[PDB]
Amino acid sequence: NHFWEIVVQDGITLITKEEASGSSVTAEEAKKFGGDVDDLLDMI
Amino acid sequence: AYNCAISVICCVFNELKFYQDSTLSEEMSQFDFSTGV
Numbered sequence A: 001n002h003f004w005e006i007v008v009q010d011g012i013t014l015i016t017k018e019e020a021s022g023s024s025v026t027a028e029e030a031k032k033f034g035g036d037v038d039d040l041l042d043m044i
Numbered sequence B: 001a002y003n004c005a006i007s008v009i010c011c012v013f014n015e016l017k018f019y020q021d022s023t024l025s026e027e028m029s030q031f032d033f034s035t036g037v
Helices: A004-010 A023-032 A035-042 B002-011 B023-035
Strands: none
Touching: none
């Protein structure tokens, strides 16, 4: 309940790799944006 | 109990895994009535 939501909403700057540019900012963009039967069938 | 479970399966949710006149006629009828048979 306190997870990468907070990381992303505050790590809007850096959350992934940064070598020079390119693949670095590409990575940033890539991340930044019985009983079982009972439960599944009796009340579904 | 298992057969009752079979019924509850088959009714609804039978899938999704369950962990397995004539004149003569009238007169003869009257005749029998008179006979009582």
